[PDB]
Each structure stands twice: as C-alpha cells, then as structure tokens.
Subunit: 907 residues, 2 copies
C-alpha cells in the first residue's frame, strides 16, 4: 500500500508576520495574532474605507494580513530583464522565489532535478486573484501605455521554464479549495507514476486597492471583525489575508529510497462538489461529510485514531456550525466518544488566504507533526454558541499542548485537513507523521567534509553566510547532513565558496572571516573560492591521494554536475537549510507615491472644486464656472430632510472661499466672505446644474453670482457673494461674544442647563425628517444655555472625497451648522421649522478642525420674520476656527405664527 | 476489462463563428469555408483602435478574427437568476452555461436523468485564457462609485455544477492554448480511475472588450499581415485569434456501450508533456512534442501506420509549423518508411486560433470527420510552407473533401484493417503539450430499440410560452431532414431534454402524423385528430389539455405524471429495448441582452482621456481669470499628439497650419459666430526648430468687437518663461463675399487636369518620398502617406490620402486636419526643392485670409500658385480640393521666410516665378 501514499518532502512559503517557516511556527505556537492594518506603503486605506456596502466604490474590509516586500523580485537571479519583471504579475515573481525555497528546502537544486529525474517534475497551483493587469489598463485609460500582468498559467509555467521541468505545469482554480485541489491532483499524478515529483501550492495577494473593493462587493467578509474567530464568536463573515505556499510531493516508496526528509504522509485525499442546494454560496454538510469519509476510507483509518483536524474554520455564523456538523457526521457513525480530537484553524492567526487556505493549513499541520505539539487556535476563548462541542468529537485548543499519540493500540499522530470553496468544491485529506530514520546522519570520513556556498551577487554573500551562521549555532543537525544538503540541495550559482573543516567551531570562525571580508583560512579550516562576478579566486591547492580535490576543483571551476555522493559511504538524509536571501530590488509598474484612480476617482480629481467642476469663461469680462449636479458624486454634501434632498447653504461659503485661488488672486491671504440667497431649494433632486460668475470689482474685491437649473428649465438665480482678503486691520472680537462662548463651552464641559445626549440629538433630527447617511450622520452633544447653544461635531475619519485640497469649510461642518440651527428652531418651539438661510455676513474660516469642534450660536434675536445670530466654531483646544458675525434666517408663514416669542434666548 | 481503459465521447456542443449549430460547422468545414471576419461593428469601431504595427502603444495590430454571435445575450430566466446578476456576470460563465445545456442534451441526459442515473456524480472541467468583463466595472470605478463586474475563473465550471446539482469535480484549468485538451486529458484519468461517472470538458475564448485585442497585440505572437491562419501553408507570419466555446461529455467506454449512448468516438490514449529546458519561454522543443505523441500512441496500443488523420495544432507561425511537423515526423518515422499516407490539417485554417478552446475545436472537427467518414480540406495551404519538406514525411495536407478510408497494412505478415483513427495535438506558448489518439466507433445494429408504435409519444417543454413556436419550428425543420427512427426521437426527447414548466405531448404512430401535429401546434392550433392526440400543461399560463383515464393504456400514467410536472418518470418502461441516444436540435434560449453598459458605449480604451479630457487636441483646458480675455493652456506631450508631430533634421516639428485649425476652433470655444463660415489670418513671430523641448502652449483670446476675435499664442520650455509664438485674427464671412479670382481658378483647373492626365513633370509617390527622406524628414507613425506631385509652369499639386487609422478618433472640432497641415508642409518643401533648395527650411511667417469651407472626407489635392519672391519672402496662394474637386480650403497668401543663402540660391529664372 506504500505506492498509494504520498510523502511531503519539501515545504516553503511567505506568510504575514514571519520571515521564515520556523518564525511562522513560533507565532502559531505562541498564539500570535498576525492580522494588521492595510499597510501605508501600498495605499492609504482611510481613502477607500467605508463601514458598509452602501457606498459603491469604497471597501468595507477593515484590515487583513500582509506579507512583506510584495514589490521586490530578484530579476537578475531568474535571468530576466528588469523591464520584463516590472510588467510581470507579482503572483508569478513571488511564487518563483517560493518555488526555489521549496525545492531547496527539500534538498533539490536545479542541477540535482536534472541529474535525478531529467526534469520530470510537475508544478500545480492556483490563486483567486491576479490584479496587476489593472496598472496597464488604467494607464491605457489615460494614455498609450504598456499592458501589465501575466496570465494565470504563466505562474506555474514560469517555474517549469526556469527549472527546465517536463512534468505537468497547470494552473487550477477551485476558489478557496484551490491549493488543496492542486495537492490532491498532485497525489493522483504521483500515485499513477505520471511524473516523479510535484510542486503544489497556492497564493493570495492584495497589492491593488481595487482587489479590496471587489472583495467587499462579493459580500462574504466581515464589516465588524478584525479577526477570523475560527469556531468562536461567529461573524457576519471572514477576513482576507495574504500568503504564498508550496509543498514538494513525492510518492512514498521513492521518498524512503531517496532518503528525503519526510514531514508527513498523505494517506488519503478526496474531493466532492456541494451539488443540489439552494444558493450558489451555500454549503451542503453531507457532501463535506462524504469527502471526509472517502479520505478516511482510502487511508484505511478509523476516526477514533484521528487526533487533530485542521478545519476550514472561516469564522462565519453559519459556515462554522455547518463545517462541524459535516465533521461530526463523518465521525459519529464509527464512535460515540466525545471531545477526543483537537480542532483548529490557521485562519485564526493569519486570516483566510483564499486559494492558499489549504496549503496554509497543511503547513501548520506539518509543523505540528514536526514539533509534536498542537498550537492554540485563537479568537475562540468563547466558542460559537450555535455549536454544542460537548456532543462532538472535537475540542478547540486554547493553549500550546503536547500532541500525544492517542491510545484507544497506541496510534500514530494522524490529522485531517479540510478546505471548502464558496462555489461548492470540498477537499479533505488524511495526513500522518513519519519517523526520522535511525541512520539519517549518513557516513562520510571527516577529512572529506566540506561546506559549499554559492550566491549570485557578492553584495549578498555576507548576509547569506550571516543567516547560515546563526542557523548553525542553534541547529541540531549532524555536520554530514549539512554538508550533503549544501552539495545537492542549493542552486549552484556563479560566486562559489568552500570551507573545508570538520567541527562546528571551525565552521563558525571560518564563516566570520568571510562575513568580515578577509577570508583568511584558519588552522582548523581551509577556505577556497571562485567568484566569477569579480573574477576573484582563492585557488584550491590540490593533492593526489584526496578524492575531494578534483570534485572541489570542478565545483569551484563552475561545473554544474559534480559527483558529491561518491564521497559518502552512505548518503545522509536531506534536511532543511536556511532559505537563500534573494536581492530585494523593487520591480513595479508605477512610482512609489502612485495612487490609482480607484483611490481618487475622476468625479473628484477632474474638478477644480467639488461644487465647481469646470472653467467655461468667455472672452467677456468675468470668469464663468459650471458643474453637473450628480448626487452620487457628492455624497459628502447632500442630505435628506422633510420635503426633499438638501445641501447646506454654508457650502456656498466654502465655494466663495475657494474662488480667489481659482482666479489666481489674494494668494496666501485668509478671507472674509458675505453671501446672500435669493432662492430656497427645498428639493435638490431635479437640479441638474450649477453656474457661477466671478467678477473683479477692484483689487480688494471679488463678487460671485451663482445659479442653478433643472431639466427643461431656464436658470434660476440662487445667490450672490462678496469676497475680501483679511488683515491685521480688522477689529478685536467684541468681549460680550467671547464671554458668551466661554460660558456656553463651560456649561458643556460641566453639563449644566438643558443638555441632550448625542442619542437624543439624533432622535430630534430623525423625528424632524432628517437623514444624514452615509457621511453626515455623526451627531454630537447639545448644550442649551441662557445665552445660546453649543453642538459638537466630530468629522468622520472616512469621507467620500479624499482628493480635494481646497475645501476650507467642510460639508460635515456646514451640515453640522444646519443641525445646530434646526435645534435652535426646535428649542424655540419649532419642532418642524425649516432652516432657510437668507444671509451670511462676514464669515472668516481658518480651517475645519480634524478633531472635534463646537458650534456656538449666540446673540440670537428675532425681528419681523428674521432670526439673526452669531456663530463660532471652536476646536477641542478652544481655538476659533470659524467666526461669523451674522447669520440671518428666514421664517416662513408657519414659523412666524408658531415661534415662541417668550423664550429667554430671544429677550 | 481493456475497454475500461478507454473513454467515449457521448455528447458534443458549442458555439463557433459562421455556424448556428454543430451541423452547420461541419458543412462549413466540409466545404472549405473561411469563417474569419472583420471585428464586428456592433461591439466597437475597430478603425479607432487599429494600427499597423506595434510601435504605437494603446492600439492593436490585430487586423481581424472570427466571432460568435450574440455574445451579450443570456437566458437569465432559464437559469433562475435575476437579470441584474446576469448583467454583472462574465459572458464566459453565461455562454458556457448555455453550451453546457446543449452538450448534456446532445448526449441525451437531462438534469433529471443525471440525477436518477448518477445522483449528479458528474464533473465539469474547462479553461479560458481571457475573462475581461471585470474591466467594465473597473473602468466605471475610475470615474465614479460603481458596481464591480465579472466572475472569477472557477465560477465558470461551478456555475454549471450548481445549476445541474452536480457532485463531481468542478475545476477551472489553464494551460494556455492547450487548456481544453488538458481538461479532456484530466477527465479521461478521472473517468478511468472511476472518480466520477461522467465529465463535461471544454474551453472557450472570447474578445468582447476592445482591450482584449490590445493586450493580445502586445503579446507579439499574432500576424500583422495576414487575415488568415495558414496552417502548414505559406505566408505564416504569426497566428490569428478566433472565438469559440466547446465542450464534450465523456464517459468510460464500457459504461457508454452498456447505457447505449451515442459514441462519437473513443479516446484511446492521451499524454501531456512540458517543453522543459530551452532558450526562450515561448520556444518549443520538438522532442517533447514527440514524447507526448509517442506516449499517447503507446497508451492506445496503436502503430503509427494505423493513424490516418492528424488534427494538428497548425497555428500558422513561421517557426511553429515546421517544428510541429518535425515533432510529428519524429513520432512516426521510427515505425515506417512510408511517406505522405496520413492526412494533416487544422480547423484553425477555417476559424482561427481559439487559444484555450483550440483543442476542443480540433476534437470537434475530428469527431465530425468520423461521423461522416470524410476528411475535410485544411484551407489556406494550396501553396505549402516552403521550409517543410512534406515528401519526407508521413503527411499530406488535404486540399479537398475526401472519403476517409479505413487504412489497411500487411504488418509483419498479417493483414490489418484499421478503423479510422486520428491523433490530435494542442501546444501552449509556455511549454505544455497535449496529444490524444481517438478512434471511430460503430453504430449498433439494433440502435432503433423496440416499442409498440401505440406507445410512441413526442414530448416537448419550454421555460417561456413565447418561445414555444420557435422551439417547435426548429424541431420541425430538423425533423424534415432526418430519417432517425421514431423510437429514438421519442426516447431522447423523454430522457435527454431538461423538463421545463410548459409541457406538450404529441401522441402518434408515424412521421406524417407528427409533422401534421407540429404544424398545428406551431400555428397555435393544438387540437387532436385521428392520426394524433395532443396534450399539454402550461404552468406559465395555467392552460391544460389533459388526457383521459384509460386503465388499460401503459402510456396514460406516465404521460399524466409528466404533464403534471413530475421529474422522475420511468419512460424506459415503455420500451422492450431502449433505443440508442441521438442528437436532437439545441434548445432555443431566449436572446435577452445582459450587459454592464448601454449599447453605443465606447471604453476610454477606444477614446483615452488624453483625447477626451481636452477641449481640442492643441487646447486642453480653459484657465481664464475674471479679467477680459479667455485663457487656455495645454501640456505639450508628444505621445498624446502622434497625429501632429514629425521629425526633420533640426528636430521635432509641428506644422504651422495646425494653428489655423486652433483659430478655427476658437469661436465655438467662446460661443461666437455659431454656424458662420470663418476667415482666419495669422502671423508667426518665432520658429521652433525642435518641439522636443516645448512643455506647454498658452492661448489668450480677445473680442475686439461684434465681428472680430484675436488670438495670441505662446509656448514654454521647462524653466523658461512663456515665449511668444504668434497671433491670429478670426472673422466671420458675410455673403457680401466675392467669388474666387478667375485667374486663380483657371490655374487650379489646369493643374488638376495635368494631374488627372499625368502630364508634364510628375514625381511618383516614391520619388516624393525620397525628396523628403534625403532632406531629413520622417512622418511616422501617422503623417506618412506621401502622394504624387505634379509640376506645371505656374504651380504645383500634391496629392494627399489621409490614412483610415489616426491617433485621435475622438475630437469633433478639427476642421483642417493635422494630416492636411503636414501635407501642406510637404508641398511647400517640394516647392523649395524645385526652386533649387533641396535642403530648404519651411518657415511659415504669415497666413492671410484662410477659409475652411469643408473638411475633405478622404483624398485631396493641395495646389500652390501665384508664387512670388520679393526680398526674403516667398509668397503663394493655396487651395485644397477633395476628390469631387470642390474647394475645401482656400488661402489668399502664405508667406515663407527664406534666409540669405536661401535667397541667393533660388532659381530666379524658374517658370514658377516668371
């Protein structure tokens, strides 16, 4: 039956929070959460983030997990021109590095694959995205440009090309189960002797911001959680992470004969599709169960003998319980025993790696075999309430524990691994530990020990050796396994170094003499090298009676096929050596500060100002600007009230402030503006445009007429503003006004007088028929005083438009003022009063504060049908950010008759 | 035992260019029909993105292709899906889903039958090299918040598996061009090892987004000269991409024989290899192709002499075709010294290279060859590839439709008659090779089965009553050309069509009765008669014409269950022997348009923002202030202005006449003189010898009064302040306007006649080209169609022919095109040359009274006359006329500046001045 089993002989990958596979294990073993924020060096996530799916074009993904150096690629090492690497998908580049790590980890240089198998090796992998082509597409939207990105099949075939492989090179996509499907396929290929080894794996990356927009619209990721709570407190959805992984697979009889490292044995694997169900993305537990049973059957293993399951564990309310039901039904036909098998998921640590979820899971499980420990499965200190684990075979491990061989006969450590595709595909495989051989150190005479290293760049030699020296200090491996694997399992590159010695001491000293750059061959070591890059040679002085002399002479001279094995009476078993340190040269289609239009779309960046799109001036005196009013381009500005969609009058204050720069005028000066409205737009729904006319009246003064229009109608005149530069010249603030604000702010910090919570402020606005979603609905506390009122605001971190750099008086602030004004109306006995601004006199605006602010209304008076008042906006340090001498409000028929003239505020 | 090693093809479907059914495709193949066509106008205007070579980034060199119809249409209702969902879904998923139905049904397996027989244990395996629908939503998101579009690759197979409730492996697999063959190969192994009961395998290629062709063009593997794939023929530069969607239903041979399926053919052996070590990612190794062929042959236990047809990759490249034939020869010649006994062709000659679908296309042709016992011609090979010595090979490329004989050989003393056997080969650019050996299979003697003719009923169902008449018409048309026994039609209708909500049954014993009844139903008269009884239940409208109780009649219960809407109905119990499945006509899906955009949409890829964000190609944006005058500014970027810039000795050049066009554009930019004919004069105050250094252009426009605009224009260079360039006056014409002076018209007349007659001193197009070349000009990529020059006593004329493909196909306010401006620069240079300045500099000082009455649609003539030399100024009058000889542009006077050594060098006695 050994011809039916498959050995994993090689393991590699890049994972978030770890620089090596062994660092990955320490993180797992120590329950480290490896999720993090979207990294600032890719894009600024605050510019595309929004809390729910209702604003199209943003993403609801709060965070993820990320590998380092996604843009780095050693193009020189893979004999590729740089311009080519710059245009090639990172999926291809980084998988190519991971492939070298996995072959090398297994103890198979390129040259050894040719010798042993004449390249008869397959490569199978999948990914669910490959978005690099967007760089060239987007550039082509603007200008004639080079396409970017690589076809999916280019990923495996480039590995096969670089390594000269003749076995099957396939890209396979089965969504989330893709890497497991590749692993399963590899096993069949190997079982039936179609190729001698297979490299199988997968990846998931998120280097383009649109990847997260598309993910968000797929509606399967959480909009609340920053973690994947595998079998714990179920979320609305999963969280996506990054990674790249591969295993090298060989049929078991052959791996034994070849004396490979065997991380574990795959003894059964099975796939099923969900089948008939109601909903594309809905699982059928029974078809999961079936794959699990087929895998166990094929492995000839009774389910009592399984002691660990690496579950899918994607973290959802409804997927997790379904998965466990699937597992339970796959066990309980054979036993009634409860909570004898551990159940976890690496998703808890690094998130859902989509196509790579299967290989990530297998990586953890193999690591557990190797250390004979079960890692914690985190974010599950509270277990999913819809799962009754006590009636299952399963316990979710909360700490690092000894993986004991279970007794029931003592059984070896056996695990099952499950991967589940959204679209229906399931995979389960049974894996078992394998014992290290008794004779794994091999046999070589000591005077024939030599340690050979090669790098492609002399710049990197010091690093590669430094990395190898520290690994050595804490390695347990016999010197003959290290020597043999260096000889047979490292790509033989152009700068070559040999250290002949027979102890660890000597090897370290020698290493340090090389790292320090002098290469003085000590008493306990001889150092030889040939560095073809520089032509430097420290020649081997050779001997007649010495089998090693010619072999070493060939290697140093650059030959690629040296009979190292002849030095050994028995070959040592292969071992894991530290990964080659690739050169980290950036290869990317764009400059580093680049922001895709996905971050700033053209509804923002094609406008001079969010409410002033285009200059349409004619040779006539005066400048003319025009804007198409499209509500969805202006989600920062428009809100609902009783009787229609609205937009603060104070936003036209921000337009008046922006005008002098649009006229190359009053540069660097801060401005006063007044503004008078001759019409009230109760419903902006059918407004199609805005027009502005700007006139220079003299050197000190600009005037702005503005209008709107609707489909089919002539223009309607809207308003008129006057804009002046500001100076030291203007009077000090009246003392009465500052006293009132001092007193109002103090009753807010102390909470005296009529006082409404944010929640109560929300209900008043809600019951008045206001809706401020998606960007204007953060409400603050209200203080009502003897002399006026204060309403706090806190601008959202995420707004719609993060491009415009000329918005001084922000729409959040503007709208916050509209709210203060309504609340004043309410306070004066007008719970339904319309806020109609007739006039604004002498508004100065330094900036909208990035933190909280307070809006203060005082000096409130009523005359005929006008409610006048003074307004200030202070920040959290109580620095005045806006000062506005007088707002005049217009009170309709109904407002005049209803208004409470008694009110203390008024008198 | 051994038959369990072989895989039967029991079903066949697809969509291919120039064919509305698989039968029509055979007819096209049998008749040698070229199915390539122009990029279709109902998708995009190819002339706006085409360029002849790869030097212009953003365009495509793809001349043509092949295309299926109705790439935008999808029966979302049949597939139980909201329309909005269908609209955002990749056509790859949508169309493969329809083809999957055709293929299951062609095999004779409804959904309900797949469930009863195998519990859905059926796999789905396909690939494609493109899925570009996501660009609609990406592009829209570049502009505004928008829904994403497109489906992931694995959504294609899993959607079929979802709709059919299948539990077998559902995989997307990409091995580039060999993808569909890799899928069929993989299916065979899964079926051999009994991992699943049947597999649907296939592939597809589509080009519905213009960018797909841009990306292909930059891949540098398609011909820039040929409108055909010349498989094994001459003129093989690079391949040409075609569209198609194909699948086959596969089952293990023993199971297929036992179930009495239609067996189109038997796959007896299949192997895959990768190219391995080699010099160049896209370079083949013929030895690894040979290894694949040998392994397939070994696996089928076939001697190479027994193979009588090969469906070659045949991609029509200069390097690939000889290499492929080398690989095939090496795979054969070890076994036989026979030459030219086996036919070799490729369906790519008819429909182009279907990339991932190349293999299932080739398999489709081969299975049709077996069915008809004929070898189809392989076209575009009447002259054979000159680097292939075919007489030293086993192979000949068939030029006609020929009968496929069972080949026969006495081998090692024993007469062997072999069945028709074919080898098929698919090759990927990146290394992967597939070869499979496929063999004809004989039709059973008793395929008609047995049933009492009283138990014949013909059952039909549709999802929408509105499509009923159409489906019955298509069945009736098929029926009129078919002699299939009635029992087989009845049974395949019973087990092999998805059972849908509107159900119709015609019960009758003969053809004549069935045809009568179909005619009736088709017309909406569903009444029974002596020779036929008609029953139905249309759940959609709730109309019922039920049968009556007959305790005796075997058909009553089953028919009642079926009409009532039951899925599990034991039709097989009517038959003493079940008939063999036959192919019935495809269901006619509703052709509703599901697309992300409206019809008429052009991607920015067609009109990029470097064109569409400008008010005019030379006038990007208004930057005016409140002071009188309008101000415009433009960033000078040569690559955004390929229509405009050329090279001369000094450097990069831009015709001065382009500024007359800018002036002509101005009054519309200022809302002035709408509709009126304009007159423009301009004076140039500086000559730019190399435009390379120019970074920007600035324009100031002023109203002098009612009837006059003045335009000032400057340029700037990096880190310099604006330099002045010139000054235009723009006035509208009155109809106070005198006609053209008579002399001037006489001269033009005579000169155009001299041109039409090829009279006097003429320079051919080639000579004019060398005059300019020897003077250091280069007009690539857009301004280089040099025409003939005619010189007479008093003027000259140069012919212009504006190329169909230019850089900017978006601007609508270009009246004097840059091609015409630059053609004027050429004429003026040729004047200088003829006056004795073969290296003369054209420096335009002044343009007096230019009117552009119309814009030539195509060809034109530039006429120079009234030529004078006064001090250092060469002045002339100029006309542009179109092919009808209507005056498009008239210009009283151009003034050229000549330097002093130029003034000394001119021939003062030349007739042009005399």
């Amino acid at each position: 039956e050994l011809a039916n089993y498959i050995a994993v002989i090689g393991l590699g990958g890049y994972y978030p929070g770890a620089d090596s596979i062994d660092e990955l294990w320490q993180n797992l073993a120590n329950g480290v959460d490896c999720m993090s924020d979207f990294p600032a060096d890719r894009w600024d996530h605050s510019k595309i983030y929004y809390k729910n799916r209702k604003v199209l074009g943003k993403t609801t993904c709060i965070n993820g997990s990320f590998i380092k150096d996604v843009d780095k690629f050693d193009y020189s090492y893979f004999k590729m021109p740089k311009v080519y690497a710059d245009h090639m998908s990172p999926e291809v580049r980084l998988f190519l590095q991971v492939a070298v790590h996995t072959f090398e980890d297994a103890g198979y240089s390129k040259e050894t694959l040719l010798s042993r198998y004449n390249g008869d090796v397959g490569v199978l992998l999948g990914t669910m995205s490959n978005d690099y082509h967007y760089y060239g597409f987007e550039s082509n939207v603007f200008r004639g440009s080079m396409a970017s990105g690589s076809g999916m099949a280019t990923i495996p075939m480039t590995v096969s090309y670089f390594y000269g492989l003749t076995g099957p090179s396939l890209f396979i996509d089965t969504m989330c189960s893709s890497s497991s499907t590749c692993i399963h396929t590899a096993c069949q290929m190997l079982k039936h002797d179609e190729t001698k080894m297979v490299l199988a794996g997968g990846l998931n990356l998120m280097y383009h911001p649109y990847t997260t927009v598309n993910t968000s619209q797929g509606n399967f990721t959480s909009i609340t959680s920053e973690s994947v709570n595998s079998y714990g407190v179920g979320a609305d959805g999963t969280v996506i992470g990054e990674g790249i992984g591969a295993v090298l697979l060989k049929r078991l009889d052959r791996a034994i004969a070849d004396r490979d490292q065997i991380y574990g044995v795959i003894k059964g694997s099975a796939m099923t599709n969900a089948g008939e169900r109601n909903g594309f993305n809905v699982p059928n537990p029974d078809l999961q169960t079936l794959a699990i049973r087929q895998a166990m059957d094929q492995a000839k293993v009774h389910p009592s003998s399984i002691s660990y399951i690496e579950g899918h564990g994607s973290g959802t309310k409804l997927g997790d319980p379904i998965e466990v039901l699937g597992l339970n039904n796959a066990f309980r036909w054979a036993t009634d025993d409860k909570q004898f098998c551990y159940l976890g998921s690496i998703k808890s640590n690094i998130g859902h790696l989509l196509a790579a979820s299967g290989i990530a899971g297998l990586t953890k499980t193999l690591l557990q075999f190797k250390h004979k420990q079960i890692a914690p499965s985190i974010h599950s200190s509270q277990l999913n309430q819809d799962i009754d684990f006590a009636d299952t075979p399963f316990v979710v491990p909360q700490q690092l524990i000894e993986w004991r061989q279970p007794e029931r006969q003592v059984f070896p450590r056996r695990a099952g691994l499950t991967s589940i595709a959204a679209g229906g595909m399931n995979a389960h495989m049974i894996v078992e530990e394998y014992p290290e051989p008794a004779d794994s150190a091999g046999q070589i005479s000591e005077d024939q020990l030599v340690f050979v290293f090669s790098v492609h760049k002399l710049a990197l030699l010091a690093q590669n050796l430094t990395s190898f020296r520290d690994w050595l200090a804490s390695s347990e491996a016999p010197l003959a396994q290290i020597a043999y694997t260096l000889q047979v399992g490292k790509n033989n590159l152009r700068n070559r170094l040999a250290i002949r010695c027979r102890t660890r001491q000597a090897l370290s000293r020698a290493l340090n003499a090389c790292i320090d750059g002098h290469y003085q061959s000590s008493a306990d070591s001889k150092i030889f090298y040939r560095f073809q890059e520089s032509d430097a040679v420290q020649p081997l002085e050779s001997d007649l009676n010495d089998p090693l002399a010619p072999l070493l002479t060939q290697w140093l001279n650059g030959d690629s096929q040296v009979d190292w094995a002849s030095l050994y009476a028995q070959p040592p078993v292969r071992i894991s050596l530290p990964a080659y340190r690739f050169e980290k040269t950036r290869c990317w289609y764009t400059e580093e500060g680049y922001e895709s239009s996905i971050v700033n779309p053209l509804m923002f960046k094609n406008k001079l100002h969010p409410l002033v799109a285009k200059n349409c001036s004619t040779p006539q005196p005066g400048a003319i600007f025009r804007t198409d009013f499209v509500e969805d381009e202006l989600l920062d500005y428009v809100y609902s009230g009783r009787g229609g969609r609205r937009l603060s009058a104070f936003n036209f204050a921000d337009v008046a402030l922006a005008m002098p720069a649009l006229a190359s005028r009053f540069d660097g000066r801060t401005l006063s503006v007044s503004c008078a409205f001759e019409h009230y737009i109760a419903d902006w729904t059918t407004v199609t445009g805005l027009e502005y006319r700007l006139f220079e009246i003299d050197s000190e003064q600009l005037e702005l007429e503005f209008d709107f229009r609707r489909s089919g109608e002539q223009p309607t005149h809207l308003g008129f503003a006057v804009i002046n530069p500001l100076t030291s010249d203007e009077p000090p603030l009246p003392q009465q006004w500052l006293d009132d604000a001092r007193e109002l702010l103090n009753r807010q910090a102390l909470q005296a007088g009529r006082q409404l919570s944010a929640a109560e402020v929300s209900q008043r606005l809600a019951q008045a028929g206001y809706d401020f979603a998606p960007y204007l609905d953060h409400d603050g506390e209200l203080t009502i005083g003897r002399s006026g009122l204060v309403l706090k605001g806190r601008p959202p971190v995420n707004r719609h438009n993060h491009y415009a750099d000329n918005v001084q008086l922000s729409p959040y602030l503007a709208t916050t003022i509209d709210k203060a004004l309504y609340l004043l109306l309410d306070e004066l006995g007008l719970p339904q009063g319309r806020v109609i601004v007739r006039n604004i006199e002498r508004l100065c605006c330094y900036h909208t504060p990035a933190g909280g602010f307070s809006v203060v209304l005082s000096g409130i008076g009523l005359n005929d049908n006008e409610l006048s008042l003074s307004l200030l906006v202070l920040d959290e340090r109580e620095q005045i950010c806006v000062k506005l001498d007088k707002v005049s409000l217009y009170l309709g028929k109904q407002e005049v008759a209803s208004v409470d003239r008694k009110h203390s505020l008024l008198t």
